[PDB]
Write a protein that binds this ligand. Structure first.
Ligand code: MG
Ligand code: MG
Ligand code: MG
Ligand code: MG
Ligand code: MG
Ligand code: MG
Lengths: 264, 313, 126, 285, 379
RNA sequence: GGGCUCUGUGGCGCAAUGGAUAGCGCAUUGGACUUCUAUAGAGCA
RNA sequence: AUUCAAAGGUUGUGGGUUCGAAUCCCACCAGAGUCGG
């Protein structure tokens, strides 16, 4: 089963199989915020870790797919064996690269040996005609993305406000979690919409291949909506070909929805 | 009602200055919290000059022909004037004319004969062939120019060329201020921004279609298109104060996006009023003379386009 | 024009506003002359104190509902739901999902038309 | 109880060599135009399959560097910085500070250089992965997560990001007499006009970084940098927009350098810029 | 050269002067008329270059001419009696003015260049004062103004008929400022000038019923294209229009009874044969000559003063901004504003002394520091 | 002025290598937008 | 409401090792930091 690391109230995923499981099984996509190991001078594509919203992590803990732990701290009693293990591993992984290095080098030489011999003979025969006319830094090391040692963490309680879960009880979290869970149960894909002036973006499928269909705005069933805001949001939705949704959780448990579109 | 060299008098109707060329005070009536002018001279002067107000039927100007645009090419072969109407629209005007007929007590069998004599200041109905015959006027539909509140106040207060009537008794910019403030509870900030902008030579219009407060045209809708889209706010000179609409970073992102799509600029205006001011000193218009204005322009810094601000051809 | 039959008939409906009645008159004038609708009428909902126009864009199709609102006002999703239920009660047919048209009218008689439905509508596949 | 978190994938020699001979071209995100309606049988399904199998290959990629291209560093948490154990490289022309005879890095510079792969961070004689570094360096004492996000976002485009040390610095009157815009009885203010008495509310938003463009990278003088291109405040997207008093305070603190607001929305960076404006009275026709 | 002309009844003697010449005529036998003024017995009077003399005769006469003449001959092509007809018809108006407590007729001589505006104005004024009347003469043609220097508007109280060569004696002659040769440069000036002098003589005729009864005579511009006709109707409906007479282009008749009130009697006339062509050079030197007959007087009877005027003494407004003193002010004009007291001409400039020397019809001090300078120069 | 360390690759920020094919991003130029707002302009799942 | 393609080179200059140099070595220009005078 999966495990998400909640530090200071933010949820990160550090493995590559947990992201695949999340997206291909539970319909949760997250957001990659790291850097790429092969593209580290660009903002187009990014890599691990994957950042989860608090609502996604709460939903995943509740349906029983992940386990929110608190980020561990080094124990300081497991340090000496750690040191000796690292030293042995470094030494053996260094002195075992030399072997396949030597083999690969002999192979990259015997592949174009004929060219070497031809060039050498040309060199020395033109030298003859002229005569008649006169370790470290090569040892490879890996920079790990996720911690390489098994540790023990203590499970976090998401239904009680704490230090590394400041979310429980806040009203905005309850509202947005109500709407997130309702939309996710209906089979939709979901993302964040800050640049579109809303709360969520709602897709009919994996956002890798589909354009979103809705921009969702979480509202309290008694809060007043300013008209100008409705007009600006409807115009923006018309400009990008997206309906404007209005979601509100009713006291009886069920959420109510309302579409907004420009007419004539 | 003064701030001008011509007639700086609140509500004297006995015009007397002396050395002047020719000023003709305009007229307007306040019907259920809306100022309207019903005279052709008044309409044409207010709209050809500064582009004041909006036509109550058309979109841009009071130019709603009750003729039909599609059938202008129908019989342009003939020599006649503007009125050419299909039959069923005049039939509907006859419906809501028999409305008036029954509402004034005349029974049906005499209504039919009286209007049959009126279907023998007037119109021309049209009708195998389709011909036309002169008819009598079914219902009056004469145009009215509908002026915004800030517009009408800038006209009466800041220029003096307009007089408003509420039950045939003219008003004053003391009780005009009071009435406009009590019907639209946010008249003061909007009129202060309107006064500030139209005093720089710009032309302010309402920005309802975009979600903002105003739009600024360089010299008018027909000459130029709007450049700036303005939102108005009021605060104290220690920056205490409530807000008309609270701005998140989702309202501003949406407003900025929809302004970039329509090639405009998102200006946020602030009106700063002193802390020594009281809610009865700001019950007079002349409080304007001690309030300050501040514009800011909100933009969208794009990270990848501004990493070399020297490259340009 | 204040003597227009529809203005006085709107006065008749015991609603209790000068803003709402004049804005309703303005939207009626915008529909019945500019947009060329047919058979537009005016019904009052005293449950919500709303003067609402019920019309037919072109003769042969179903009825539509238009609630003329000014910009000064503001709504909550609960009142939106109240008006959706009122509209459904009004035009009658429970087949199509509840929906109405909100006509936001400015001070100088500038109108913007939005359409509120109950459920999920797709952006533009019609 | 206590759950035991599994951890890590160790690249073998044969796969370290394979990761050395890596390409440089990124895969295309979507293979052509995205769809609009999910109703389909086998084209959409196979297209999604391929668009996914390419994602699980990118994210399962580890950094592999040589032991000589790597500067060796150490993390001093009590003093609060990173100490290099070797001479720095080309990054030392825009990043770091030399004190007491040794070269040192702030925590966010160290984390960004660990992510790029230019240094090799240690802590208590043991090297740190990127998870452990994220957990150690990104506290509330050193630097927060949003500030590091903005810092790295900018630094991956080419900019010079330094820490902001407060010690851094017509109408119808058809009268042919027009002058008559004397109607102006509404005085215009400015942003720094009265910010030296507003600083008494020294709380709320704060300037965090100075930003120099990428044209300033080849001739940058760390000791005498000059006047920056921008200053940066870093907030969140769910947070209150700054007021007029806070805008005046920040616009007086900054000076005559422009000031930018960076908002992070669940991992997405966006930049806005408030600027005082003076409408041109000129409209003369 | 002595020439004998016999001008029998209903005949026009056409003669005008060669350049730099002298002409001497005297009514030897009988009576004769000069533009409405009956010339006295055997009076030897002189005629200077460029001056036009189309003398029609009522009773015929025997005329002596000693000197050279550009054109000089007898003509039976004469419409001048139609002249009288207009007058004689409007002669009714004359006494009918004081019949029913009404005020007299005022009449326009409207038409383009080369029509005889001032010819009919001549005869109408002279015959007015012949029948005991005392007419108001308003001249507006700033191109060749004779009420003052051209580039101004003027008004004359006709005490007695004009003399043979010089004319009606200027006693309190109304002058007002225009500044330029052509109203095409600024119409607002002509507009408020028309209204100004119209209401001015409104007051004068209501306080001096003399001209109220005796009516008025006007001279307007010869403009027929552009805002000329618009200002023509402006002036007519401002000048209490009674009768308007068109000068031999009936296009004026068509549009003139198309844009006046029905009350206005529009009467057309073909001009006399005595209307001679006068191109640019003519009114050029006749404008400079009107400046000369303002400042130096006919035959040199005006002796003006030539000396300094302080910049600390006078302020000028240029038709609205006062003009900073610059050496562009040489040989322009200056109007002393009270109405207008008089006019003066500039000769030289003093910078560090800050005084410019002027030539003056009256001595120091000038009755006002109110001055308005010219657009045209004369030296 | 002298010593020591580091750096120099496409307009800019940068990869690569026992030492065996000089390519990534931004900017630029072009297309399609099942795009939108209207010859444009704007495009940030 | 996005998505795709093309073009773009004095690898600071010279020399050396090498069959083969952006890559390894030396010298010389240009720049940054530090020690210090
Ligand atoms: Mg290089
Ligand atoms: Mg280069
Ligand atoms: Mg470079
Ligand atoms: Mg190579
Ligand atoms: Mg795009
Ligand atoms: Mg070299």
């Amino acid at each position: 089963m999966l495990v998400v690391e909640v530090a200071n109230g933010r949820s990160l995923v550090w493995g590559a199989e947990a992201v695949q499981a999340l997206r291909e099984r539970l319909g949760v996509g997250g957001r990659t915020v790291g850097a790429l190991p092969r593209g580290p001078r660009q903002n187009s594509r990014l890599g691990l870790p994957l950042l989860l919203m608090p609502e996604e992590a709460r939903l995943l803990a509740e349906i029983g797919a992940v386990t929110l732990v608190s980020a561990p701290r080094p124990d300081s009693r497991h340090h000496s064996l750690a040191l000796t293990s690292f030293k042995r591993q470094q030494e053996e992984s260094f002195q075992e690269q030399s072997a396949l290095a030597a083999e690969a080098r002999e192979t990259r030489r015997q592949e174009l040996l004929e060219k070497i011999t031809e060039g050498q003979a040309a060199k020395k025969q033109k030298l003859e005609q002229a005569s008649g006319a006169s370790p470290r830094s090569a040892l490879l090391v890996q920079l790990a993305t996720a911690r390489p040692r098994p540790v023990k963490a203590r499970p976090l309680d998401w239904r009680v406000q704490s230090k590394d879960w400041p979310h429980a009880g806040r009203p905005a979290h309850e509202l947005r979690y109500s709407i997130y869970r309702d939309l996710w149960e209906r089979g939709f894909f979901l993302s964040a919409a800050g640049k579109f002036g809303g709360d969520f973006l709602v897709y009919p499928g994996d956002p890798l291949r589909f354009h979103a269909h809705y921009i969702a705005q979480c509202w309290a069933p008694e809060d007043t909506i300013p008209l100008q805001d409705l007009v600006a949001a409807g115009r923006l939705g018309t400009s990008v070909r997206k309906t404007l949704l209005l979601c509100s959780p009713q006291p009886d448990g069920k959420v109510v929805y309302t579409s907004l579109q420009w007419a004539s | 009602v003064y701030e001008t060299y011509e007639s700086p008098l609140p509500i004297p109707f006995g015009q007397d200055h002396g050395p002047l060329k020719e000023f003709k005070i305009f007229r307007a009536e306040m019907i259920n919290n809306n100022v309207i002018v019903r005279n052709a001279e008044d309409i044409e002067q207010l709209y050809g000059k500064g582009y004041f107000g909006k036509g109550i039927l058309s979109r841009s100007r009071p130019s709603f022909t009750i003729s039909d645009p599609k059938l202008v090419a129908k019989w342009k072969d003939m020599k006649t004037n503007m009125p050419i109407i299909t039959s069923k629209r005049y039939q509907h005007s006859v419906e809501w004319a028999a409305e008036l007929m029954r509402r004034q007590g005349q029974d049906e069998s005499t209504v039919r004969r009286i209007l049959k004599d009126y279907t023998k200041e007037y119109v021309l109905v049209e009708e195998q062939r389709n011909r036309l015959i002169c008819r009598r006027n079914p219902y009056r539909i004469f145009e009215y120019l509908q002026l915004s509140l800030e517009e009408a106040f800038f006209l009466v207060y800041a220029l003096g060329c307009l007089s408003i009537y509420y039950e045939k008794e003219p008003l004053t910019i003391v009780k005009l201020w009071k009435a406009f403030t009590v019907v639209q509870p946010t008249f003061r900030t909007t009129y202060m921004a309107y006064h500030y902008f139209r005093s720089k030579g710009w032309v302010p219009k309402v920005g309802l279609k975009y979600g903002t407060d105003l739009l600024l045209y360089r010299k008018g809708p027909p000459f130029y298109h709007a450049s700036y889209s303005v939102i108005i706010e009021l605060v104290d000179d220690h920056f205490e104060g409530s807000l008309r609409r609270p701005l998140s970073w989702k309202s501003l992102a949406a407003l900025s996006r929809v302004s970039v799509n329509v090639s405009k600029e998102l200006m946020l205006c602030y009106l700063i009023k002193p802390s020594t001011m009281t809610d009865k000193e700001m019950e007079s218009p002349e409080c304007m003379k001690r309030i300050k204005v501040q514009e800011v322009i909100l933009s969208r810094w794009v990270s990848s386009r501004e990493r070399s601000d020297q490259d340009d051809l | 024009m204040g003597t227009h039959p529809k203005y006085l008939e709107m006065m008749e409906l015991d609603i209790g506003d000068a803003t709402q009645v004049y804005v309703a008159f303005l939207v009626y004038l915008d529909l019945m002359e500019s947009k060329s609708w047919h058979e537009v009428n005016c019904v009052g909902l005293p449950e919500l104190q709303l003067i609402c126009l019920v019309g037919t864009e072109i003769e042969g199709e179903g009825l539509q509902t238009v609630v003329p609102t000014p910009i000064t006002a503001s709504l909550s999703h609960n009142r939106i739901r109240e008006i959706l239920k009122a509209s459904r009660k009004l035009q009658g047919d429970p087949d199509l999902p509840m929906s109405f048209t909100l006509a936001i009218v400015e001070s100088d008689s500038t109108i913007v038309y939005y359409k509120l439905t109950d459920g999920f509508m797709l952006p533009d596949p019609q | 109880a206590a759950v035991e978190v599994p951890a890590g994938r160790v690249l073998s020699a044969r796969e370290l060599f394979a990761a050395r001979s890596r390409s440089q071209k990124l895969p295309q995100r979507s293979h052509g135009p995205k769809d609009f309606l999910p109703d389909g049988s086998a084209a959409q399904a196979e297209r999604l399959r391929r668009c996914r199998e390419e994602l699980w290959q990118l994210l399962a990629e580890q950094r592999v560097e040589r032991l000589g291209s790597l500067v060796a560093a150490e993390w001093r948490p009590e003093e609060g910085f990173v100490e290099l154990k070797s001479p720095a490289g080309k990054f030392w022309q825009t990043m770091g500070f030399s004190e007491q005879g040794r070269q040192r890095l702030h925590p966010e510079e160290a984390l960004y250089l660990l992510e790029c792969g230019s240094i090799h961070l240690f802590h208590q004689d043991l090297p740190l992965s990127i998870q452990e570094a994220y957990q150690l360096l990104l506290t509330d004492h050193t630097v927060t997560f949003l500030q590091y996000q903005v810092f790295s976002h900018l630094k991956r485009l080419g900019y010079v990001v330094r820490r902001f040390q407060p010690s851094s610095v017509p109408g119808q009157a058809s009268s042919p007499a027009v002058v008559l815009q004397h109607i102006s009885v509404l005085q215009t203010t400015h942003l720094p006009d009265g910010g030296a008495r507003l600083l008494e509310k020294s709380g709320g938003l704060e300037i965090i970084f100075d930003v120099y463009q990428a044209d300033a990278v080849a001739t940058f003088r760390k000791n005498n940098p000059g006047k920056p291109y921008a200053r940066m405040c870093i907030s969140g997207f769910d947070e209150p927009v700054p007021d007029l008093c806070s805008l005046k305070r920040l616009s007086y603190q900054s000076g005559d350098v422009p000031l930018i607001f960076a908002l992070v929305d669940h991992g997405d960076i966006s930049f806005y810029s408030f600027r005082d404006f003076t409408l041109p009275q000129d409209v003369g026709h | 050269p002595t020439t004998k002309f016999e001008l029998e009844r209903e005949t026009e003697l056409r003669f005008e002067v060669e350049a730099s010449q002298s002409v001497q005529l005297e009514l030897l036998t009988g009576m004769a008329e000069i533009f409405g003024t009956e010339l006295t017995r055997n009076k030897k009077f002189t005629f200077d270059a460029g001056a036009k003399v189309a003398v029609f005769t009522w009773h015929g006469c025997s005329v002596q001419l000693s000197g050279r003449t550009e054109v000089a001959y007898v003509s039976k092509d004469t419409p001048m009696l139609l002249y009288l007809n207009t007058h004689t018809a409007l002669e009714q108006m004359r006494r009918q003015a004081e019949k029913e407590e009404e005020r007299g007729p005022r009449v326009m001589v409207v038409g383009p260049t080369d029509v005889g505006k001032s010819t009919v104005c001549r005869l109408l004024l002279n015959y007015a004062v012949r029948l005991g009347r005392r007419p108001t003469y308003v001249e507006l043609d700033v191109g060749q103004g004779s009420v003052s220097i051209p580039g101004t508007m003027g008004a004359l109280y006709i005490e007695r008929p004009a003399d043979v060569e010089e004319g009606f004696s200027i006693q309190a002659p109304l002058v007002y400022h225009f500044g330029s040769t052509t109203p095409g440069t600024n119409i607002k000036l002509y507009n408020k000038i028309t209204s100004r002098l119209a209401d001015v003589f409104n007051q004068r005729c209501e306080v001096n019923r003399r001209a109220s009864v005796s009516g008025c005579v006007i001279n307007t511009c010869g403009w027929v294209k552009g805002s000329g006709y618009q200002a023509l109707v402006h002036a007519a409906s401002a000048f209490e229009v009674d009768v308007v007479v068109v000068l031999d282009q009936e296009r004026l008749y068509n549009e003139l009874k198309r844009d006046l009130p029905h009350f206005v009697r529009t009467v057309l006339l073909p001009k006399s044969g005595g209307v001679v062509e006068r191109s640019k050079d003519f009114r050029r030197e006749c404008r400079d000559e009107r400046i000369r007959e303002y400042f130096y007087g006919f035959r040199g009877c005006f002796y003006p003063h030539a000396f300094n005027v302080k910049f600390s003494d006078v302020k000028i407004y240029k038709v609205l901004v006062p003009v900073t003193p610059g050496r562009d002010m040489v040989h322009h004009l200056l109007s002393v504003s009270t109405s207008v007291a008089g006019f003066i001409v500039v000769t030289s400039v003093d910078l560090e002394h800050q005084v410019f020397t002027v030539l003056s019809p009256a001595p120091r001090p000038l009755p006002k520091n109110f001055l308005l300078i010219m657009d045209i120069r004369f030296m």
